[PDB]
Amino acid sequence: GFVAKDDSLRTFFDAMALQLKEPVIVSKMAARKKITGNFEFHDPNALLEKLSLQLGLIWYFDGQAIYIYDASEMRNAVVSLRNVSLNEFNNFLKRSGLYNKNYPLRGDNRKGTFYVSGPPVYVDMVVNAATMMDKQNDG
């Protein structure tokens, strides 16, 4: 695996990227911080979720690459959904493979809106998809 001794997170996630196929893109904000410890590379994704609790990093795999950001870079959005059922759009993203259970969407079956919270690429994916799906049924 890898023993980090005050090494940058970028160095650390590059060492993790050596065990991965897809590219790993670490934000500048995360790259500036350092990490120390003996980290077994049996499951790089478990390290990513581990540092959500240890350092406060968030990430999203979009199917082609792993984006790693600081949790303070997390984006929030308010998205109305007039022509699509809130449960229907949730299933749509789950069916699409875009939805991420680590960053749940905050809907309300008594209202016509929902909230998006997550890393910048996760938020952009949900919000763009929501726009597409609502306007698609607009007629």
Q: Which stretch binds a copy of itself (CB under 8 A): 9-17, 36-44, 48-56, 83-91?
A: 48-56
- The answer to whether residue 38 forms part of the interface with a copy of itself (CB under 8 A) is no
What contacts 35, CB < 8 A, 6 or more positions away?
4, 6, 7, 8, 9, 12, 51, 55
Give which of 99, 14, 20 is closest to 62, Cα–Cα: 99
Coil, strand or helix: which one is 6?
Answer: strand
The count of other CB atoms within 10 Å of the CB of residue 114 is 20
Out of 5, 6, 42, 72, point to the residue binding a copy of itself (CB under 8 A).
Answer: 72
Q: Which stretch binds a copy of itself (CB under 8 A): 2-10, 38-46, 69-77, 81-89?
A: 69-77
- The answer to whether residue 21 forms part of the interface with a copy of itself (CB under 8 A) is yes
Give the residues lining the site for a copy of itself (CB under 8 A): 21-23, 53-56, 64-65, 70-72, 74, 78, 113, 132, 136
